[PDB]
Amino acid sequence: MTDQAFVTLTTNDAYAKGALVLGSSLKQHRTTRRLVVLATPQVSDSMRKVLETVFDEVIMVDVLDSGDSAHLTLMKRPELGVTLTKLHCWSLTQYSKCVFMDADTLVLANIDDLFDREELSAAPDPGWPDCFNSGVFVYQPSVETYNQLLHLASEQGSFDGGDQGILNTFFSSWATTDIRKHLPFIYNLSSILPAFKVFGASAKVVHFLGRVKPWNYTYDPKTKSVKPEFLILWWNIFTTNVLPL
Amino acid sequence: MTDQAFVTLTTNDAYAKGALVLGSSLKQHRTTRRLVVLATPQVSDSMRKVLETVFDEVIMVDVLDSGDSAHLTLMKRPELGVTLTKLHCWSLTQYSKCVFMDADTLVLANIDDLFDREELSAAPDPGWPDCFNSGVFVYQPSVETYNQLLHLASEQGSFDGGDQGILNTFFSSWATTDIRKHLPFIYNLSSILPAFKVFGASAKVVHFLGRVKPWNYTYDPKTKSVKPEFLILWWNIFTTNVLPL
């Protein structure tokens, strides 16, 4: 299936270690789709070489470059540099449908059935459930949709300063229209109690939303612990699958 | 509209002060439906007299009495006394459709359009959004449905020990079937940040989920403060509307 792909984003070498675990977990449960990672010039050249060993395409996005399609929007909204870089996922018109996943997510089972969904399909966000969490969403690349999002960013910006705010404003009918575009919470399980004991075993994707990202923990290979099984599995994939590359 | 009603529950005099504010807020925004409160013998006789000044029906429920329909279930599940008392809302077969609201909720605008919904319509719960919050839900009373819930309580109980767990287990298709049965989050806004600045103004019902209930705060009538505008409005309705009764 060279027609569809999983898309992620790395703005530095720290988040690149998260995408390496995400891409390895996508390979571990045997995905038939392509693996795409969007990278900025802040990612070092040697870290991009490590990313090529996991992902099928390492696409460079530099919103600071005047030739970039989102550069004029950046001058109006200089605080949305990361957001405008992520919005380049709609520019990947070589694919018909994609599933974007942030670098701080981890896959626990095959989620290729997400490509049976339409744009825009996303899981509900905890805290404000009438907004979807932009950590995992199924979309369809389009130059039209991409230019629509850039104009919305220039006109209004983002009410949370990130991508989730503007994406919820653009796809504002998500909470009341089609329930098939509501992904189950197990496709984007927030790391932040009795409900977990009943449904947490059916988790497919865990979203690390804590203050300390998984790669910023101090991992002890002797005890296989850190300074909670999901955080241990992240470092297990990182040491077993990612490092020998 | 003597055919439909709002239903609440009071197990003691402390929660009875919350139902007095809830019923007063329902009267403040002019509801055309009946006001029903379920009370246990633990509510004092004089507090029931105060409840009759607000609600149209004060219905007594005593699961400790051997003649109660849920008494045999209580012997199997002695920890679900409050839950089995709340489940008596389905026994109110004199109404065709009802909207249950917990005593720790507060109404900010007319929500009579909730009776355009079907059973079971409820708002998503924050924390685990694939489960609905049982603080506000639209249901249809039925002896059949009530006996179905009692048997589920005897067989499995509740995975959270309260009503929300068993109600989510019984109405398990809520998260994936009809989106019209997904009430907007403003119909049950949890008191527990950038999303509030955009949508919080459209709030219709606020659900006080904090550790300290609104009636357990120390209210100073001089400064109109407590020991945050929703907690102030609760005590304003309590002092202006409830006390002169």
Swiss-Prot record, chains A, B:
Pathway: Glycan biosynthesis; glycogen biosynthesis. UDP binds at residues 9, 11-12, 15, 77, 102-104, 207, 210, 213. Its cofactor is Mn(2+). It catalyses: L-tyrosyl-[glycogenin] + UDP-alpha-D-glucose = alpha-D-glucosyl-L-tyrosyl-[glycogenin] + UDP + H(+); [1,4-alpha-D-glucosyl](n)-L-tyrosyl-[glycogenin] + UDP-alpha-D-glucose = [1,4-alpha-D-glucosyl](n+1)-L-tyrosyl-[glycogenin] + UDP + H(+). It is found in: Cytoplasm; Nucleus. Mn(2+) binds at residues 102, 104, 207. Its main location: cytoplasm. GO terms for biological process: glycogen biosynthetic process. Inhibited by palladium ions. Phosphorylated. One of its GO terms (cellular component) is ficolin-1-rich granule lumen. It is linked to Glycogen storage disease 15: A metabolic disorder resulting in muscle weakness, associated with the glycogen depletion in skeletal muscle, and cardiac arrhythmia, associated with the accumulation of abnormal storage material in the heart. The skeletal muscle shows a marked predominance of slow-twitch, oxidative muscle fibers and mitochondrial proliferation. Polyglucosan body myopathy 2: A glycogen storage disease characterized by polyglucosan accumulation in muscle, and skeletal myopathy without cardiac involvement. Most patients manifest slowly progressive, hip girdle, shoulder girdle, and/or hand and leg muscle weakness. Polyglucosan contains abnormally long and poorly branched glucosyl chains and is variably resistant to digestion by alpha-amylase. Part of the GYS1-GYG1 complex, a heterooctamer composed of a tetramer of GYS1 and 2 dimers of GYG1, where each GYS1 protomer binds to one GYG1 subunit (via GYG1 C-terminus); the GYS1 tetramer may dissociate from GYG1 dimers to continue glycogen polymerization on its own. May also form a heterooctamer complex with GYS2 (via GYG1 C-terminus). Glycogenin participates in the glycogen biosynthetic process along with glycogen synthase and glycogen branching enzyme. It catalyzes the formation of a short alpha (1,4)-glucosyl chain covalently attached via a glucose 1-O-tyrosyl linkage to internal tyrosine residues and these chains act as primers for the elongation reaction catalyzed by glycogen synthase. This is Glycogenin-1. It comes from Homo sapiens (Human). The chain holds residues 1 to 260 of 350 of the full protein.
